[PDB]
Design a binder for this molecule. Structure first.
Ligand SMILES: [K+]
Ligand SMILES: [K+]
Ligand SMILES: [Zn+2]
Ligand SMILES: [Zn+2]
Ligand SMILES: [Zn+2]
Ligand SMILES: [Zn+2]
Ligand SMILES: [Zn+2]
Lengths: 183, 385, 5, 353, 576
């Protein structure tokens, strides 16, 4: 079995997100203002100047590229609640209409990256990796988590969709809830 | 600021003689929602028979408004919802399983037969009724097939598929600056309050039962947003309210509204599920405690538009509507019913009266004090019409 | 919920 | 025509003897209308023209009920939006629909030596991200799922419980009503709305004395030779303080949705309107909630997340007293000197004329 | 204090803590220096408010609302909407109306299409074979509706054949209109005959349950009246009033509230009514022997003659005028040996406090009682208040019932139920109160069923006179308590003290204290005590619950009276 340590502030962020998409009937505002690509690019471009040895930089770049590929391939499969699959279908439709394939890393924000991170240990323990490689992945993810906790005040604000504007969440109508959940 | 009052009988005003117009389509009664659903357009037929056997046809003009078109319906609702309503039928329903869940038209509101035609009759009657009030050419306009105050812009709720009160008020707004809409159903008029929630040209005022009751909207603190703040009045009450209590709550609020808002036209939704012995309501009004509201709204003397509504027992609603129309024509009708086609529904007394129960009334004077004080404090900010 | 049927 | 209607029998049939036994003791003027109605089309808009197994009864992904697209090989069934990618319910491809797992099996021909082959080649190709190689290979063998937080995340907060269908609940859910299945049966007209019987709703259940409303300081039990003097006492769900329905201007008994909360709890969310948000955390129990007792008392700020003793800051009534008095005193004197300086500036500006 | 809460929000919160204290809340106000605001609506983004909505002009976008949304699934918190109860007889009425509506719907639709087919047939026969061969009907048959005749013909004609017959009617009506008209005719007459045969049974069933459906408080009264008319409830009421008085007079600014209960008896004949009812019950019942019967009768008679100071001669003349139309002291009975022999013979401080304030021609009398006497008196007041309610409705209800405008058009057609009348239970122009009393006497005698008594009392008055359904059980309990007041020894001694004091013509505070000590001598130190005070000039009664350390008289308002009373109580060696 594998174990990952997540700061309790990000755990409360995840529980808040679970409360919203569930009995508050909110979805996320897409396309996000800060997407997964932007977060990972800023992280890598800020950390690559930190340590000098080339091996650290190679490992960092490989981890970021793999995280991008894996989020792309995993988002629709396992990372969406049941209310948010109608949104996924509408995005897929309006993408296929414009002859362009959907690329989820340029649309979805940091809360879905946090979902992927939190669910990573079970996906790791379900494969047949080494043990050195599992612990290397867990180390890289814990470093990313502490970096992200340092910036948590920049990506995870609370702004009340019902009050002013431009919060990270939006309210759903009864037609969306009728076709999404009760269909 | 509530104070208890008795209930003195109804005496018509001899000065206020109004040229009433009555809208009835002889086809509306033949469309039945289902076997055992509590909605009957038959109660509109019954009523009419009474109205015709008392001799009330010699007193007013009787019309048959030409029915609404799919593009006068879409003045409020959306094209997709109206297209669904026009196309669906009880046989091809299995082919529309994704719009039956989006638009909510499967089981609480079923698909039965000639649904589009019932909606057309309702909407045409009410838009036409309101259009004759603007052309200078009536004073009251009665249309009992309307009053579907639950339907939303793209959804049906509460046995209502088309919101025709909103179409009528839109038709009224073309000539009148301010319009008032009073709702004395036992439910909340949520569709009419939603459609005009941010505007200061329509003022909605609804007296309803609040609790764990359908539709669960309409608290004392829902007063509007935007430019239409303080222009929405919700009066929530408890079970078993009676005639004297309802009168002492109804008359001061409406007098204050008329003094500060100063509407140019009224729309009174007189649905009769707030009567005694109903299938869904929980109030304890009688016939005269229900027609006193209509008489008081008629007192002020501005263009008026009376529409139907709920009502789950057919005989109570029929008799109350007949009595209300009679007193709109400045007569108090006899209490002995005449021989008509549906004479046997009105047993065992065969009289024009609806009896209350000995149900227990739970609306205390201090609760109504608090409610009316809050309402008047709010209304203080709508004065300069 | 809703209104009866 | 012989088919029974609501009445119990065919329509062209009178009542049976059983019904008439158990139900017994032993020109008009609307002929008109087609003569008086004349159509109205006075409206403004008249210009407008106008192994023979069966599939499961629940979705394999969300584990809920509905209309499923089913798989023939395996007994799985999925909603239409619960697939990857979601399928349009109208334009459904007929022919043989298989899921992801059975398609993977038929692709590898149920041969895992070929699985060795393809996975080795795959890991050789994805040399750029070699850490995520095997992971990137397993994702293609799984039927879709929905997201549910791992249980090592939900159990950090003990006031949080997974609902029936994997929904959020946070101790403010009252409970579902169990003997309100017993309520559909009921005791006759002895209602769950609490009407007609309030002698024993004003009496403390365990101790035996009366529940005294907090605002008016009376238990208006009335007298049940005059039941119009009772006043419908109700107790808060958190502090158990009793209130009359006419004192907290409510007109209902909270029975279904959430717990009713007395006016005597502070906030749990603020909206300062200056606009900013919460000063209240979550309850991180599991005995990882660590407390701090600051060595300075009259200036510490630290949160709105205090705990009052005779990260959570431990504070006492004396420091709260001092902080309140200090804040109001200094705000008083500051606003007074501001008005003083404004008015004296006004006087030198006016005498300047 | 930490700049998270605004000032007016703080004051509004403190209003829920110190609201009822005026001094403290005003001091706080003066020392502290003093968006969806509705719970039902949500704001959608301005990306869901873009739907075609063809017919909307420029004013309909300005006026109508497209952003804020409510719905009865998240206003119910996803689980809600309780419904009203609707007792059984209402359900019986609902099912009758459903059957009625079904029959009327089918009949009326069949005729709406029958008239159209009639006119098209009488127009279609007038042609030569040429036009008949070329004739066809448009979709709608020249009427305003398009679905009525379709529904009718499909219901009548086995929907498959209904479809082929309707499209044949649309194609060539020269041959198919007659047979469809004939079938519609015959099924119309069949359904109508069945409908009248069903209309008889519906009328009688509805005649039995209409009035029973309309009383929601009388169907549950005989079981709510034996649970709520016990001793514990009658004591809990006065206890709660007492604790309310004390707990709220802790608020110093309010004036002192006086004794707990107050009753008034404006009518003096209801006493003879209750005496007649109790006498009927005693003469019927078999629980007591004849000695016990006459002792109970005389006890009740002289108790009501004593407490309310009604002369025995007036009582006898009242029962004279009563019963001719239907065609020593109480202590003599208290220590029953008396009645059996009877009917077998057939310094400066205390002194000047005592000197001024002597009440001569006493009008306010006191009775110190235990629970027995209190419960007996409360049963008496209950019967009195109920009879007084109906006696005050009397004149209006009799004027209503004697002028019932029964239409003979419903008299002849068997449309009115005479089943209540032929047995003599309808209140014909007799008096209403006297008829109620006679019916209750027959019910107590056991010669009238309960169902017919309740039905009479529904129809005659309204569902407003339901409190008389238990008029026999309250009298049962009254006579039982009146027997308790003469079986016990302690209560016998208490009533003897009451007789001796009431017969006395003059008293003072000293004698009141002596009498209270005397009556408390008999009952234990854990017993409750009540003061029942009768004011004769207005016929008023006040009941005061005595906490063992109570001021045995009502609280005065002056220093003089209060302190001189307790310092003259200082004269006796009993504790202060
Ligand atoms: K209403
Ligand atoms: K408004
Ligand atoms: Zn309604
Ligand atoms: Zn599913
Ligand atoms: Zn499969
Ligand atoms: Zn209170
Ligand atoms: Zn509380």
């Amino acid at each position: 079995k594998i174990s990952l340590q997540i700061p309790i502030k990000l755990k409360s962020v995840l529980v808040d997100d679970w409360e919203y998409v569930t009995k508050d009937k909110k979805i996320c505002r897409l396309p996000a203002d800060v997407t997964v690509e932007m977060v990972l690019n800023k992280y890598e471009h800020e950390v690559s100047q930190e340590l000098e040895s080339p091996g650290s930089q190679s490992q960092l770049s490989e981890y970021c590229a793999g995280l991008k590929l894996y989020f792309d391939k995993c988002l629709g499969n396992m990372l969406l609640y049941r209310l948010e699959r109608l949104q996924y279908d509408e995005l897929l439709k309006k993408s296929s209409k414009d002859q362009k394939p959907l690329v989820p890393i340029r649309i979805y924000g940091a809360i879905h990256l946090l979902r992927l991170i939190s669910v990573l240990p079970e996906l790791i323990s379900s494969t047949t990796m080494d043990l050195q490689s599992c612990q290397l992945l867990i180390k890289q993810t814990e470093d990313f988590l502490v970096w992200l906790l340092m910036h948590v005040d920049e990506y995870f604000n609370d702004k009340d969709p019902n009050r002013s504007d431009d919060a990270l969440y939006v309210n759903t109508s009864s037609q969306y809830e009728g076709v999404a959940l009760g269909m | 600021v509530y104070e208890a009052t008795p209930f003195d009988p109804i005496t018509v005003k001899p000065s206020d003689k109004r040229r009433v117009a009555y809208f009835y389509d002889a086809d509306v009664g033949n469309y039945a929602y289902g076997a055992g659903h509590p909605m009957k357009p038959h109660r509109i037929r019954m009523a009419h028979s009474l109205i015709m056997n008392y001799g009330l046809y010699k007193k007013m003009e009787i019309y048959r408004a030409k029915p609404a078109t799919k593009q006068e319906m879409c003045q409020f609702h959306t094209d997709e919802y109206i297209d669904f309503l026009s196309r669906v039928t009880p046989d091809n329903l299995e082919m529309f399983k994704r719009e039956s869940v989006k638009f909510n038209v499967g089981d609480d509101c079923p698909v039965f037969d000639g649904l589009y035609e019932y909606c057309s009759i309702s909407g045409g009657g009410s838009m036409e009724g309101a259009a004759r009030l603007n052309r200078g050419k009536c004073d009251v306009a009665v249309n009992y097939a309307g009053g579907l105050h639950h339907a939303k812009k793209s959804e049906a709720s509460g046995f209502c598929y088309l919101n025709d009160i909103v179409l009528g008020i839109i038709e009224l707004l073309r000539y009148h600056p301010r319009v008032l809409y009073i709702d004395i159903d036992v439910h909340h008029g949520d569709g009419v309050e939603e459609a005009f929630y941010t505007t200061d040209r329509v003022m909605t005022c609804s007296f309803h039962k609040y609790g764990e009751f359908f539709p669960g909207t309409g608290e004392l603190r829902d007063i509007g947003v935007g430019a239409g703040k303080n222009y929405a009045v919700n009066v929530p009450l408890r079970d078993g309210i009676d005639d004297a209590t309802y009168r002492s709550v109804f008359e001061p609020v409406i007098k204050k509204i008329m003094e500060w808002y100063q509407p140019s036209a009224v729309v009174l939704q007189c649905g009769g599920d707030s009567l005694s012995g109903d299938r869904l309501g929980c109030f304890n009004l009688s016939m005269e405690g229900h027609a006193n509201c209509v008489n008081y709204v008629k007192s002020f003397g501005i263009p008026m538009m009376v529409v139907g509504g709920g009502g789950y027992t057919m005989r109570n609603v029929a008799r109350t509507w007949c009595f209300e129309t009679g007193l709109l024509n400045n007569v108090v009708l006899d209490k002995d019913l005449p021989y008509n086609e549906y004479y046997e529904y009105y047993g065992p007394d065969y009289k024009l009266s609806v009896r209350p129960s000995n149900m227990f009334n739970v609306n205390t004077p201090e609760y109504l004090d608090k409610v009316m004080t809050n309402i008047f404090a709010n209304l203080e900010n709508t004065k300069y019409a | 919920x809703x209104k009866x049927x | 025509d012989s088919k029974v209607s609501v009445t119990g029998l065919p329509l062209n049939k009178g009542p049976s003897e059983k019904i008439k036994r158990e139900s017994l003791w032993n020109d008009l003027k609307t002929f008109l209308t087609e003569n008086m109605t004349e159509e109205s089309n006075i409206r403004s808009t008249i210009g407008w023209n106008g192994i023979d197994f069966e599939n499961e009864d629940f979705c394999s992904a969300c584990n809920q009920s509905g209309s499923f697209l089913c798989c023939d090989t395996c007994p799985k069934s999925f909603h239409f939006l619960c697939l990857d990618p979601p399928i349009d319910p109208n334009n459904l491809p007929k022919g043989d629909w298989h899921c992801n797992e059975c398609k993977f099996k038929i692709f590898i021909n149920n041969s895992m030596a070929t699985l060795k082959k393809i996975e080795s080649n795959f890991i050789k190709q994805n040399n750029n991200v070699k850490i995520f190689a095997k992971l990137l290979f397993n994702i293609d063998s799984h039927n879709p799922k929905q997201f549910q937080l791992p249980n090592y995340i939900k159990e950090t907060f003990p006031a949080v419980k997974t609902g029936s269908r994997g929904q959020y609940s946070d101790e403010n859910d009252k409970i579902p009503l169990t003997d309100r299945q017993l309520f559909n049966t009921s005791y006759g007209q002895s209602i769950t709305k609490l009407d007609s019987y309030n002698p024993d709703t004003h009496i403390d259940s365990n101790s035996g004395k009366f529940l005294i409303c907090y605002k008016c300081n009376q238990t208006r039990l009335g007298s049940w030779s005059h039941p119009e003097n009772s006043r419908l006492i109700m107790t808060c769900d958190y502090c158990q303080t009793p209130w009359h329905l006419d004192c907290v201007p409510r007109a209902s008994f909270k029975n279904l949705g959430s717990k009713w909360k007395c006016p005597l709890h502070s906030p749990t969310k603020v909206y300062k309107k200056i606009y900013k948000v919460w000063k209240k955390q979550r309850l991180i129990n599991k005995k990882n909630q660590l407390y701090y007792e600051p060595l300075q008392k009259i200036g510490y700020q630290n949160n709105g997340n205090i705990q009052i003793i005779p990260k959570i800051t431990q504070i006492d009534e004396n420091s709260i007293k001092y902080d309140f008095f200090d804040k109001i005193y200094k705000s008083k004197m500051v606003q007074k000197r501001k008005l003083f300086q404004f008015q004296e500036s006004l006087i030198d500006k006016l005498v300047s004329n | 204090s930490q700049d998270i809460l605004d000032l007016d929000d703080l004051v509004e919160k403190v209003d829920f803590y110190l609201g009822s204290n005026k001094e403290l809340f005003t001091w706080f106000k003066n020392f502290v220096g003093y968006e969806a605001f509705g719970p039902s609506y949500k704001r959608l983004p301005k990306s869901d408010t873009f739907m075609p909505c063809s017919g909307r002009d420029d004013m309909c976008w300005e006026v109508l609302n497209d952003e804020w949304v409510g719905h009865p699934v998240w206003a119910s918190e996803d689980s809600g909407f309780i419904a009203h109860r609707k007792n059984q007889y209402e359900e019986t009425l609902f099912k009758i109306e459903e059957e009625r509506h079904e029959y009327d719907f089918y009949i009326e639709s069949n005729l709406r299409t029958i008239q159209c087919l009639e006119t098209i047939v009488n127009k279609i026969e007038n042609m030569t074979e040429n036009e008949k061969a070329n004739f066809k009907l448009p979709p709608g048959l020249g009427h305003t509706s398009m679905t009525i005749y379709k529904k009718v013909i499909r219901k009548v004609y086995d929907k498959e054949r209904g479809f082929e017959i309707i499209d044949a009617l649309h194609e060539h009506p020269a041959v198919t209109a007659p047979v469809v008209l004939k079938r519609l005719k015959q099924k119309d007459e069949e359904w109508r005959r069945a409908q009248r045969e069903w209309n008889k049974v519906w009328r009688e069933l509805e005649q039995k349950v209409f009035f029973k459906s309309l009383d929601h408080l009388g169907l549950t009264f005989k079981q709510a009246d034996k649970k709520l008319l016990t001793t514990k409830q009658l004591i809990s009421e006065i206890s709660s009033i007492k604790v309310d008085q004390t707990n709220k007079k802790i608020h110093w600014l309010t004036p002192k509230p006086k004794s707990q209960l107050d009753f008034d008896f404006p009518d003096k004949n209801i006493f003879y009514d209750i005496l007649c009812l109790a006498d009927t019950f005693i003469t019927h019942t078999t629980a007591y022997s004849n000695p016990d019967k006459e002792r109970l009768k005389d006890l009740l008679k002289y108790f009501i003659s004593l407490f309310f100071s009604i002369s025995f001669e007036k009582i006898e003349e009242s029962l004279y005028s009563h019963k001719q139309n239907v065609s020593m002291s109480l202590l003599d009975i208290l220590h029953r040996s008396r009645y059996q022999k009877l009917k077998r013979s057939n310094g400066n401080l205390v002194e000047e406090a005592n000197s001024q304030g002597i009440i001569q021609n006493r009008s306010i009398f006191n009775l110190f009682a235990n629970t027995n006497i209190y419960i007996f008196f409360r049963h008496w007041t209950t019967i009195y208040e109920r009879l007084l309610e109906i006696k005050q409705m009397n004149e209006r209800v009799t004027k209503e019932i004697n002028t019932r405008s029964t239409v003979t058009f419903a008299k002849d057609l068997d449309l009115l139920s005479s089943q209540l009348s032929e047995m003599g239970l309808d209140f014909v122009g007799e008096d209403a109160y006297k008829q109620v009393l006679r019916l209750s006497r027959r019910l107590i005698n056991g010669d009238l069923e309960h169902q017919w008594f309740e039905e009479s009392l529904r129809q005659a008055y309204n569902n407003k006179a339901f409190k008389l359904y238990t008029i026999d059980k309250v009298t049962q309990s009254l006579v039982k308590h009146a027997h308790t007041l003469m079986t016990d020894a302690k209560t016998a001694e208490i009533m003897a003290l009451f007789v001796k004091d009431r017969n006395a013509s003059t008293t003072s505070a000293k004698d009141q204290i002596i009498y209270r000590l005397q009556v408390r001598s008999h009952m234990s130190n854990t017993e409750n005590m009540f003061r029942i005070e009768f004011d004769k000039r207005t016929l008023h009664v006040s009941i005061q619950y005595i906490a063992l350390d109570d001021l045995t008289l009502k609280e005065p308002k002056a220093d003089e009276d209060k302190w001189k009373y307790y310092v003259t109580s200082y004269a006796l060696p009993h504790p202060t």
